[PDB]
Amino acid sequence: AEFDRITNFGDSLSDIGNKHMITVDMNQATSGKIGIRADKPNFDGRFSNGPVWTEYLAGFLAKPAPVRGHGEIDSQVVLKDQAGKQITYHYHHNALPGTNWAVGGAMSGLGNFLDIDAANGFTAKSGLDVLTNTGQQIKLRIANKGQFTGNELVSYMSGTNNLWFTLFGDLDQTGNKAAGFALTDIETLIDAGAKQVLAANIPDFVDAPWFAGQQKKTTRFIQSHNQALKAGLDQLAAAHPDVEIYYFDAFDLFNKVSNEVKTKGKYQDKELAITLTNVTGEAYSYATGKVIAQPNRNLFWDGLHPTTAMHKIMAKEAASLVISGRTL
Ligand SMILES: C[As](C)(=O)[O-]
Ligand SMILES: C[As](C)(=O)[O-]
Numbered sequence: 001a002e003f004d005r006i007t008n009f010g011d012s013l014s015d016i017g018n019k020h021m022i023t024v025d026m027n028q029a030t031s032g033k034i035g036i037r038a039d040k041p042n043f044d045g046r047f048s049n050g051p052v053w054t055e056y057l058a059g060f061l062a063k064p065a066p067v068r069g070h071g072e073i074d075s076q077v078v079l080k081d082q083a084g085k086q087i088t089y090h091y092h093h094n095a096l097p098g099t100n101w102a103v104g105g106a107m108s109g110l111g112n113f114l115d116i117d118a119a120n121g122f123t124a125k126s127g128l129d130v131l132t133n134t135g136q137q138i139k140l141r142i143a144n145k146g147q148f149t150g151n152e153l154v155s156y157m158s159g160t161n162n163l164w165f166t167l168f169g170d171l172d173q174t175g176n177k178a179a180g181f182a183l184t185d186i187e188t189l190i191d192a193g194a195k196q197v198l199a200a201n202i203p204d205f206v207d208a209p210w211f212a213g214q215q216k217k218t219t220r221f222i223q224s225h226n227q228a229l230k231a232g233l234d235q236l237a238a239a240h241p242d243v244e245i246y247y248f249d250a251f252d253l254f255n256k257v258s259n260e261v262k263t264k265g266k267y268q269d270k271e272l273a274i275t276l277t278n279v280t281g282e283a284y285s286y287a288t289g290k291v292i293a294q295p296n297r298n299l300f301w302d303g304l305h306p307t308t309a310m311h312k313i314m315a316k317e318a319a320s321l322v323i324s325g326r327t328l
């Protein structure tokens with residue numbers, strides 16, 4: 001074995017419950033005043049109806065299952081009631097040892113980000129920016145657990161939120177700007193000792209329901225991001241021959257799966273016991289509360305995140321690359 005354990009960094013595609021559990025614990029600490037993310041009918045705090053690809057990945061590589069990790073959280077939560085009066089809670093959570101540092105909402109780059117809402121009629125003034133961008137996760141893992149020793153496979157899957165908050169937030173990043181942030185982060189991993197890196201591009205989200213009417217902007221972003229990331233990783237691989245870099249082309253996998261459903265009616269993998277027959281609709285609608293009968297016939301769980309079947313598909317592809325030594 002070249003590695004005996006896996007470390008994960010990224011966003012809702014990878015998170016096994018950080019976003020969920022930090023909003024549960026902040027809601028308890030504020031006595032009901034924080035909205036819970038990834039609530040039922042999402043599965044056990046994942047942004048899906050089952051395990052996500054980082055969980056299947058560890059099974060397919062026969063390594064230990066991911067365990068959630070994060071750093072110490074310490075914030076002054078300042079809320080405002082109806083009448084404009086401020087109320088405050090000092091929120092703390094100790095650092096949580098683990099291996100999967102991903103968090104829903106995270107963008108490539110450093111720093112914390114804001115993507116938690118007040119609840120129960122309160123508005124939030126400050127103190128909810130407790131979640132960590134992908135590069136911040138890396139920084140915190142090194143602070144908490146030291147440098148990498150070479151016995152880890154490190155997965156890095158980020159960039160979707162750099163697009164998301166460009167569309168629906170306050171950002172204006174180009175794809176190749178966002179890619180540069182990912183390349184900086186991945187260079188931090190190498191400078192910190194990582195010797196095996198599984199780096200993913202952004203999936204082909206052309207048909208994601210939440211991106212309807214954003215297609216020109218999404219398409220240009222994703223194509224520019226993924227071309228920049230690939231070229232940048234080729235360059236890092238040439239400069240660091242002691243590092244195995246695996247390029248998980250999530251884009252092409254989503255594209256291939258979707259073109260098989262569009263042209264042939266189905267994408268089937270009998271080794272995995274999966275058949276997808278829908279790549280354009282939500283299995284779960286956040287308007288009716290509708291969850292269709294057989295959600296694992298769909299690529300999309302909600303308007304963006306994949307079903308657990310599509311997560312399994314992703315994991316098999318990524319594992320395949322590692323098993324076959326298919327490096328840059
Ligand atoms: C800052 As305090 C209310 O936990 O002493
Ligand atoms: C910023 As998002 C789709 O993780 O809510």
Ligand SMILES: [Ca+2]
Binds near residue numbers: 012104105161164
């Ligand atoms: Ca998201």
Ligand SMILES: [Cl-]
Binds near residue numbers: 006141
């Ligand atoms: Cl770790």
